[PDB]
């Protein structure tokens, strides 16, 4: 089945230059990796990718999450790969954590996808559009809060 | 050198440090997972004892807070003491970088 999960944020607090969403990405990527998954984080831009590449060495706290930007790391890519539109990713990945503002076609190749519904009202419509798009692409949809 | 400390048959990683942490430590556990090494495949030894291993031993190792390289054949990863690794994000990225340089020893292709 394809499974897409939309985490609903309850704030838009920025910390160390990281949006509320990017902070949650670090938590999710670590938990999925630790559960034995190969993770792809699809960033909307190169700059966002460098922001998360750095953020993942500091958070979650007391963790060592092996990761690299799309074209770096070990052969086949690091367990957690961080890419951007202008940069092809490593194959053989179990879960997609997408920071793309609009539905990305490469998402359909995954069985598990994680997307978000930002707090700021001005971004909720884009999120709604994405939701409908996953529905059209055949994904089984569900929303959740992270804890 | 009559008596020596032998590396068990199932061990694939020798962890060396002045203070041997608990393999279930949050940070230690993540590093082991990064190395695709299960805790059960780890032999923890203080710097002393490495000199007691039989001449010709071959096993990968990870040493913490011990600059002097081990006299143990194998891929050798080195990082600051656990205390310092846990608080230095830069140190952690460097450890990973060091691990990647040895991908052929820890993540053999097949």
From Swiss-Prot, chain A:
InterPro entries noted in UniProt: DNA_pol3_chi, PolIII_chi_sf
NCBIfam families cross-referenced by the UniProt entry: PRK05728.1-1
UniProt family annotation: Belongs to the DNA polymerase III chi/HolC chain family.
Domain of life assignment: Bacteria
Reactions it catalyzes: DNA(n) + a 2'-deoxyribonucleoside 5'-triphosphate = DNA(n+1) + diphosphate
Assembly, per entry: The DNA polymerase III holoenzyme complex contains at least 10 different subunits organized into 3 functionally essential subassemblies: the Pol III core, the beta sliding clamp processivity factor and the clamp-loading complex. The Pol III core (subunits alpha, epsilon and theta) contains the polymerase and the 3'-5' exonuclease proofreading activities. The polymerase is tethered to the template via the dimeric beta sliding clamp processivity factor.
Mutagenesis / variant outcome for changing residue 64 to A: Cannot complement the AZT sensitivity of the knockout mutant, interacts with SSB, decreased interaction with HolD, no interaction with YoaA
Lineage: Bacteria, Pseudomonadati, Pseudomonadota, Gammaproteobacteria, Enterobacterales
Phenotype of gene-disrupted mutants: Knockout mutants are sensitive to high levels of chain-terminating nucleoside analog 3' azidothymidine (AZT).
Record note on what altering residue 54 to A does: Cannot complement the AZT sensitivity of a knockout mutant
Protein source organism: Escherichia coli (strain K12)
Enzyme class, UniProt record, top EC level: transferase
Outcome (variant: residue 131 to L): Cannot fully complement the AZT sensitivity of the knockout mutant
GO terms of molecular function: DNA binding; DNA-directed DNA polymerase activity
PANTHER family xref list: DNA POLYMERASE III SUBUNIT CHI (PTHR38767:SF1)
Keyword list, A-Z: DNA replication, DNA-directed DNA polymerase, Nucleotidyltransferase, Transferase
Mutagenesis or variant effect for residue 6 to A: Partially complements the AZT sensitivity of a knockout mutant
Protein role: Part of the beta sliding clamp loading complex, which hydrolyzes ATP to load the beta clamp onto primed DNA to form the DNA replication pre-initiation complex. DNA polymerase III is a complex, multichain enzyme responsible for most of the replicative synthesis in bacteria. This DNA polymerase also exhibits 3' to 5' exonuclease activity. Genetically identified as involved in the repair of replication forks and tolerance of the chain-terminating nucleoside analog 3' AZT. This subunit may stabilize YoaA and/or stimulate the helicase activity of YoaA.
A GO CC term attached to the entry: replisome
Xref: Pfam families: DNA_pol3_chi
GO biological process, one term: positive regulation of DNA-templated DNA replication initiation
UniProt protein name: DNA polymerase III subunit chi
E.C. numbers: 2.7.7.7
Annotated disulfide bonds: none
From Swiss-Prot, chain B:
Name used for this protein in its record: DNA polymerase III subunit psi
Alphabetical UniProt keywords: DNA replication, DNA-directed DNA polymerase, Nucleotidyltransferase, Transferase
Listed EC numbers: 2.7.7.7
Molecular function as annotated in GO: 3'-5' exonuclease activity; DNA-directed DNA polymerase activity
Species this protein is from: Escherichia coli (strain K12)
EC class (word): transferase
Reactions mediated catalytically: DNA(n) + a 2'-deoxyribonucleoside 5'-triphosphate = DNA(n+1) + diphosphate
Example GO BP: DNA-templated DNA replication
Similarity comment: Belongs to the DNA polymerase III psi/HolD chain family.
Organism phylogeny: Bacteria, Pseudomonadati, Pseudomonadota, Gammaproteobacteria, Enterobacterales
One GO CC annotation: DNA polymerase III, clamp loader complex
UniProt function note: Part of the beta sliding clamp loading complex, which hydrolyzes ATP to load the beta clamp onto primed DNA to form the DNA replication pre-initiation complex. DNA polymerase III is a complex, multichain enzyme responsible for most of the replicative synthesis in bacteria. This DNA polymerase also exhibits 3' to 5' exonuclease activity.
Coiled coil location: none
Quaternary structure and partners: The DNA polymerase III holoenzyme complex contains at least 10 different subunits organized into 3 functionally essential subassemblies: the Pol III core, the beta sliding clamp processivity factor and the clamp-loading complex. The Pol III core (subunits alpha, epsilon and theta) contains the polymerase and the 3'-5' exonuclease proofreading activities. The polymerase is tethered to the template via the dimeric beta sliding clamp processivity factor.
